[PDB]
Amino acid sequence: AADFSLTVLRARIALLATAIGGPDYTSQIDPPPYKLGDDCLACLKDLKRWFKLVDDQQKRWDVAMAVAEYRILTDDLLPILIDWENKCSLAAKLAKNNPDHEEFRNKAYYDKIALNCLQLLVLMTWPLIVTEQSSSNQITLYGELKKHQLVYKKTILSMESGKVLRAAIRLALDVIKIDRLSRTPRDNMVLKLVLNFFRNVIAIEPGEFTINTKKSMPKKGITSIDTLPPNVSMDDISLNTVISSFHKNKVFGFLLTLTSSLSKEFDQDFINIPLLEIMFYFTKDVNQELLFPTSAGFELSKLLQKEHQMRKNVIKHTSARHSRFGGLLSIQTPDKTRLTVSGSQALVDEKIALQKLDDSKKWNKRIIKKHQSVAAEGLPNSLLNSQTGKAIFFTESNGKHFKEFINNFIDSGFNILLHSVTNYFTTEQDRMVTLEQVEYLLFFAWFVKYQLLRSKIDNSADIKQVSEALKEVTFILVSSLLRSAYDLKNWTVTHAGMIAFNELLNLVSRTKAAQEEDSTDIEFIVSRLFSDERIQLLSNLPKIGSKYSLQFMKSCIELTHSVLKVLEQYSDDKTLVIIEVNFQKVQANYMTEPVIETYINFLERFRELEDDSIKKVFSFFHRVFVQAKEQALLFRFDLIILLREMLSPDGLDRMSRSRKYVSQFSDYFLARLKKRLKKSPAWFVGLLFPPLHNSEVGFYQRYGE
Amino acid sequence: IDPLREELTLESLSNVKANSYSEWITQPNVSRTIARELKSFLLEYTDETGRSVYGARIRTLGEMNSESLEVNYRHLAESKAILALFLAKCPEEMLKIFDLVAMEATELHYPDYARIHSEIHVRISDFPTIYSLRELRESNLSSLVRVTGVVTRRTGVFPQLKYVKFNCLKCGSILGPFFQDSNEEIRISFCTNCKSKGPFRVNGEKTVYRNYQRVTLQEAPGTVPPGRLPRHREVILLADLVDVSKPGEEVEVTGIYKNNYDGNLNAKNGFPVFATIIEANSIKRREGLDVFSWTEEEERE
Amino acid sequence: SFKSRALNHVKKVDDVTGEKVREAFEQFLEDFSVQSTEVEKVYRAQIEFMKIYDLNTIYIDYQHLSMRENGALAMAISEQYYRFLPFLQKGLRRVVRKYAPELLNTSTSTSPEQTERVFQISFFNLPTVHRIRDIRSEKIGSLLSISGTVTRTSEVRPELYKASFTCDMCRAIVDNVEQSFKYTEPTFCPNPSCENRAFWTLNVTRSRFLDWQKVRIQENANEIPTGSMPRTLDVILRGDSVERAKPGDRCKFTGVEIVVPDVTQLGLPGVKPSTTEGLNSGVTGLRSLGVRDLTYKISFLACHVISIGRDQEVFLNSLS
Amino acid sequence: RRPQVKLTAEKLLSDKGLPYVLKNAHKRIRISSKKNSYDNLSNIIQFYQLWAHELFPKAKFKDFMKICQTVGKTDPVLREYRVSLFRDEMGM
DNA sequence: GCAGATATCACTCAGCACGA
DNA sequence: TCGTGCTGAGTGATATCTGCTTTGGGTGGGTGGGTGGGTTGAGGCAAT
Ligand SMILES: [Zn+2]
Ligand SMILES: [Zn+2]
């Protein structure tokens, strides 16, 4: 019965689809226009009722799949919408040419039809989130719906050079034309609909590969994780295409006008969240480094030169003769026993022989990494879970347009938008959902970082455009959200708040450096953000970060470095008072075994790391080693192995900037360790096991006296 | 009213709403519309004189107890262009629907004809597009193609299963009926009754067979460019078509150009290549049909 | 009700060098121009020509590549061609989208068959020409040109390019599966609930195929040493370069030297696994090869082919 | 059926192990100012890897170090001895 | 009786939250 | 400030299982054996 019911539903939906309309192949004109059926609006209303009754109330998604299967969106709605746009364009042309000319028979009917198609399209492009309460049917139809939405996005951005965006903009103009005091709630509904349409268009991204885990991993393993439709490639739905289409249709101007006039020509409740989410999605994956630096030839030559060096280093480990040439080495250890190692290269170098003996071992100790995807908690892909280095590549024109748009927005209305959002969500702190918190914090952090970079690069711009960043209310809101996240153990929002706090610290330090005299007002804000509870929380943050994702640890490193820098600056400049704050005690709070463990675990992935991160980790290492003289903390063995791996010819690039810091820190650590070992023979065994916590010998163990 | 019983119009058929032609045709409503239109074309087509060509053709078919109703492609194109286009693009499903419609039309004239024959195959006679064994490419796969060549091989006539019925070896359950494609054998990798991946076997001694023959079609020596190797394919002739040609004949074959996975070819060449063969739908000899044939009128001359 | 884990596409590590080569190729294809008798963009004009005349292959002169960007781009493409080929196609597709959007899709009633166009890049005018005897294993995956005599030409066959399978349990769909050298089927069902892992059915209708032809060539007689058996080689032609080489004549191929494994050992459905007196033992160790060893055989993937050697009005029109 | 070999305190405290390290660790290992830091690190890791292989061939070097960390954190008898060596030096 | 490909079950280990 | 008992998770070893042929051809043989099977025809070259 259920299968028969599904078949009947599919047949009814198909019959409705055929009744919407079709191209007028009969007409001689053969850019075939899409003629409308006599009851087209009836079919639109019927589809709206279908969605309402089935998709939402019955907790099903078969209706959406049936609609997608028959190419309703790509073959019907886009035709009528684009034809309506074209008809309005001709009408405007005639009106401008002659005011008396009026050929728009059934104008009201056309506008109602266009609004209905826009609402239907918005309904069909809503984000899909999988939750624990979702039905099994809601779960089994996730990948198919995601692929259908990807196809929808491609068609939207490609069909007629994306004139759908122009039609939506035209609807927005029609709405705004009427006066503010004359605006009814329906106009605000239409504006919200347009903003949601833009957000949906920007947000659609490829899904995720979910696999059952009832039984063990087969020895065949995973072959591929590709989750794209048949006809859609990555570049079609890339952000570059979105930017190009938006510029071609003059979409950025509409958003600029909407944000500039906010609080002067529009209400705030139907405006704040839409634009805020749109702009969070706009910079969800963008990295500010790319924005501010043929060039491609020079970069290619540099990369080829790096690959050549890597190849040269690899060649040193390969045998001149073929694999089956033979040759067995017998290396005798001091206790009159010899182990056999094969390979030609092992004969000449002892290090290679030992390394091969190591690799030949089969048993591997466990490593358990329990990680939850963002989709599990209903969050989109962003900097939180993306790679530290994943960069979206832009063409020159698209990048220039993106830079211009962001610069104009920041210069125009960032402060007003931030003020409105922060006030609204201070009024409504309690019912915040993780998605909104993460989005708001990420938007704040990204824009503050971009403004900081722009100020650093050039002095023509101003640093006051982010004045609301230092405003007290935003700081209290951010601190409250971070504290609540820490209390409730919500690590995603915790990471977002960590990034936001890092950005706020960078901003405060930069503004104090720029103008110290006016910093007296700034001195008020710093006193608030270094409360005893806040200091304890920041100190504890690195400790827990060891057993989490790499990005969380990177944010921990960033936040710790910024906090230390700001605290040192303020302590040196004047007497810091929240209780007088001395740099010594706060530094001591930061010297603990878990902190060093977290740092070592972070530096274990130096191959994928950037120069700045390496510089910062080694700066903290220098601080711990020298400033406080706690060398006992770093007298571990993982550090020695990591140092040798990084200084090895096959490790970190020799002709690299970080290698200078690595070599200096090594030299110093080796010298101090040799001195201590000569003084204290017992440390020969202490290098392996963790330090004691015994009162009788703890002092001697740590300080050696 | 049952939604599945609703029928579209003729124009709506041209407006296709589906990923592929086969998906569009397979839909219930479109299938019913196609059946109705094909029946109307068969029952209402008239030539210059106004004589119902296909009525007389069906009467003659019944007279000889034949199971083939020859249909002119040009007539279908002139009457309903969209149906001709669908038949060209998706021959298998259109031909299935056409066979059902033709069996209904034949039963219209001879009510009890089902006793003599249960299936009346429909054969397309004059395909406007003529191809050669050299110009066949991947784009022609799974579509009606007309080719010319000379027969240089032929095999004997054998019976082949038309509906198979498998069984299990772990539980002994018997699977349902299936349709045996002429190019690939039926494969089952999981049961439904015991729902186990165990071995299987062919059972159900009750089965309905069909004739099967294979010939090798080669390009005409004259058509081959100067001193180039001729190209050959293998043609499969099903029931009602076996023993219709013998080696050393020039023939024109209209059929479906199909492909299937062959392990031997992949192992040999070293790339994922698929074997290809033509499932014949009609064979003709190569004015008219034969000069030597004469008529009663000529015999008087 | 079930336990599932998810792997995200954003987790993938991108190839920086490949993307840089893609950008360089895009810039070269866009801004390159040659002085005529006027100055015109050779490759933008060529793309417009293809757009008007519906062509798939875009011919690129290697000397032009070497001239621009100090030759670093030429070195990158030539030394490692198999690695960088997909990025070149990505750059070409981006340029086509920028200038000729309609060329991307394949070309009384509507037609739903609109598949992605499979562009092909042909390189010619290589500064050096090799011989079948000069082919070495040190230059596998490099762009080089060879000459030979066509001794045989297999028929045109369809080659599985990007398959599309449907689960036999839940009747799902898995599309865009890349076949390397053998019939490759998916392993894990995308549906979280389904338990299928090895039972799939190929959707022969929704898949995509490419034209395939194998051509055998032997070294030209004069080049051979006195009283020596000619050495043979296998050449593979795809796309629009099929049925261009003909038996007997002498042709100049340009392409990439590849190596074909013994697919039988890797595991083919239906098929069973499996001069030198036992010395030709392959390489073993892979999990797929439980106890068997894999032997290799050199081949050649050619992208360009050159042939070294009615009424009055028709001829007169050809004459200038 | 068979218990897995594991780096217990008994093996560490045997004649081979910590007693072996205390016996001969400074003589074999030598950090020289003239030699580069990489060579000294290689020498130290060379000594410790040889000792670990002689004692615990089961696990690789990094796994051996991690297991040593865990055991030192857990085992109390190991802590007893570790404290004892430090106590003797305080006595010296 | 013998080797190889395959799937099943049982045992032990690192994380977690609470109580001392 | 911290120590330990309970839990889910994942390999390791071990249980059943299929398979143990396979194959056309003379650098795989005839002490592996015909109940595992192999049934050309044109064209070139030495002898004369
Ligand atoms: Zn069964
Ligand atoms: Zn499945």
Short mmCIF file of N, CA and C in Angstrom, two decimals, chain A residues 8 11-12 14-15 17 21-23 70-71 76, chain B residues 3-4 6 8 15-19 24 27 29:
data_model
loop_
_atom_site.label_atom_id
_atom_site.label_comp_id
_atom_site.label_asym_id
_atom_site.label_seq_id
_atom_site.Cartn_x
_atom_site.Cartn_y
_atom_site.Cartn_z
N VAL A 8 1.26 6.63 -6.69
CA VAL A 8 0.15 7.54 -6.99
C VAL A 8 0.58 8.99 -6.77
N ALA A 11 2.74 10.01 -9.70
CA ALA A 11 1.94 10.22 -10.90
C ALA A 11 1.18 11.54 -10.83
N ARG A 12 0.59 11.84 -9.67
CA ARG A 12 -0.13 13.10 -9.52
C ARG A 12 0.81 14.29 -9.68
N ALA A 14 3.62 14.39 -11.36
CA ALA A 14 3.99 14.50 -12.77
C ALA A 14 2.87 15.14 -13.58
N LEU A 15 1.63 14.72 -13.35
CA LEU A 15 0.50 15.31 -14.07
C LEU A 15 0.40 16.80 -13.79
N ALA A 17 2.92 18.71 -13.01
CA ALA A 17 4.05 19.34 -13.69
C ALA A 17 3.74 19.58 -15.16
N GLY A 21 2.70 24.37 -17.80
CA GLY A 21 2.87 25.06 -19.06
C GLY A 21 3.87 24.33 -19.94
N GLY A 22 4.39 25.04 -20.93
CA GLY A 22 5.39 24.48 -21.81
C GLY A 22 5.82 25.45 -22.89
N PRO A 23 6.96 25.16 -23.53
CA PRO A 23 7.43 26.03 -24.61
C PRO A 23 6.44 26.07 -25.77
N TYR A 70 11.29 15.18 -12.05
CA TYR A 70 10.67 15.62 -13.30
C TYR A 70 11.16 16.99 -13.74
N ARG A 71 12.28 17.46 -13.19
CA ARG A 71 12.92 18.70 -13.64
C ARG A 71 11.93 19.86 -13.62
N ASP A 76 10.59 24.44 -15.72
CA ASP A 76 9.38 25.25 -15.66
C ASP A 76 9.60 26.57 -14.93
N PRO B 3 -5.68 8.49 -10.49
CA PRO B 3 -4.68 9.31 -11.19
C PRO B 3 -3.91 8.56 -12.25
N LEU B 4 -3.63 7.27 -12.03
CA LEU B 4 -2.85 6.49 -12.98
C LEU B 4 -3.58 6.27 -14.30
N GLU B 6 -5.32 8.70 -15.93
CA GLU B 6 -5.38 9.92 -16.72
C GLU B 6 -4.42 9.85 -17.90
N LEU B 8 -2.55 12.12 -21.16
CA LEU B 8 -2.14 13.44 -21.60
C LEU B 8 -2.67 13.70 -23.01
N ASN B 15 6.79 17.79 -25.13
CA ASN B 15 7.40 18.42 -23.96
C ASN B 15 7.81 17.33 -22.98
N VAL B 16 9.09 16.99 -22.98
CA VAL B 16 9.62 15.91 -22.15
C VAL B 16 10.06 16.48 -20.81
N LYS B 17 9.66 15.80 -19.73
CA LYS B 17 10.03 16.18 -18.36
C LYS B 17 10.60 14.94 -17.69
N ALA B 18 11.90 14.71 -17.87
CA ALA B 18 12.58 13.56 -17.28
C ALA B 18 14.05 13.65 -17.65
N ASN B 19 14.87 12.85 -16.97
CA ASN B 19 16.30 12.85 -17.23
C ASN B 19 16.61 12.29 -18.62
N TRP B 24 10.98 8.97 -19.48
CA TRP B 24 9.75 9.64 -19.90
C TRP B 24 8.74 8.63 -20.45
N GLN B 27 6.86 6.08 -17.91
CA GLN B 27 5.86 6.57 -16.97
C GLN B 27 4.48 6.04 -17.34
N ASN B 29 1.32 7.26 -17.29
CA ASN B 29 0.45 8.12 -18.09
C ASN B 29 0.98 8.28 -19.51
#
